[PDB]
Amino acid sequence: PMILGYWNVRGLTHPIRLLLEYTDSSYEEKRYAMGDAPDYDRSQWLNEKFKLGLDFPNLPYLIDGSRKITQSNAIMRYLARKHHLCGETEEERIRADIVENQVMDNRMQLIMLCYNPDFEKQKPEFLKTIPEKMKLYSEFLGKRPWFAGDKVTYVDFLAYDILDQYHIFEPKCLDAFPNLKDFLARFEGLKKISAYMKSSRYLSTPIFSKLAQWSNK
Template sequence: METKPKLYYFHGRGRMESIRWLLAAAGVEFEEEFLETREQYEKLQKDGRLLFDQVPLVEIDGMPLTQSRAILSYLAAKYNLYGKDLKERLRIDMYADGTLDLMLMIAQAPFKPPKEKEESYALVVKRAKTRYFPVFEKILKDHGEDFLVGNQLSWADIQLLEAILMVEELSAPVLSDFPLLQAFKTRISNIPTIKKFLQPGSQRKPPPDAHYVEVVRNVLNF
């Protein structure tokens, strides 16, 4: 029996959340160890499991994987969510990198002073509506398929849905001018493995709160 992947990170979203999404969409069960103390983090460092002394860390296939982008591309390839050829993989990479830019803006905002945090969230919504979502609306319109690349579910679809839901937490009507993205959101949300992940009680994490911010600061000493 194959060992379940094990994820080492904080009890929150951050750079691990897209990894959780990808595994869940692939129907892969995983275990988690949450970092709550500086000592836990230092032990991972001393054990040589953090290549650049950074988390997230994912143990899978007998390997300790670090660097979130590398982890995501490995998982996408392993679970057939990375297109059928190099050209499709390139498009998936471009689309995933675009949504990641947006999500990192959201992930970093809670660590800023209150005024800057609110300004960051407002900028996220603005950029989503003017820079990112129009691109994906056009992609869906131009090729007329259910998915962003080819006609099958890929890492790009999963991460776009994650990004949409994150921005909707900041502004519920953000998709009001994007009918194809509205339909995309409904369609991808109803894929059985993803629908399960979106239910209460799953391993999906809530938006970061003050406690999460405090734990991260204490563990990483910043």
């Protein structure tokens, strides 16, 4: 089988776990654990970081036979090409390129606030900003059923993830965008997905390490 390695956290690997399932990949995961405070030992990983033969060692990684990959986006694109889940048209490619990089931006912003020592001070001004981030998702999708077009592509996995996360963080952030909420239910309703969500392998939380101030446990 293929081997997925990551922390025993949702982090940024939710979209890869979901694509592996949707595509019926035959895989196993090694979920590394971080020691507890104060130290938050990372030795379970560090001990083999440089022994897997990865060009640029990092988590997540994917071993797929003789193919070895790091960087979540490259893993996602690798799977997308393997299982034909890319945009077919120039327009679809442009939309997937954009979204793919927009979700990373929006992710880094959440990670930054979340691991910010002044998280409580920070919520307030950060939440005033969500509505305009959702609007931009909302208008981009418009009436299309999926982000690049007429077909589910790997970016739907990235966009579902990030929208789901913003929603955990601000339950009402989406009341004003029925099309986003509609997107989250169309996505949760794909066949292998609904099944994966009721399984032992499913991990929606925690999101971050115990380092976090949010969704850290």
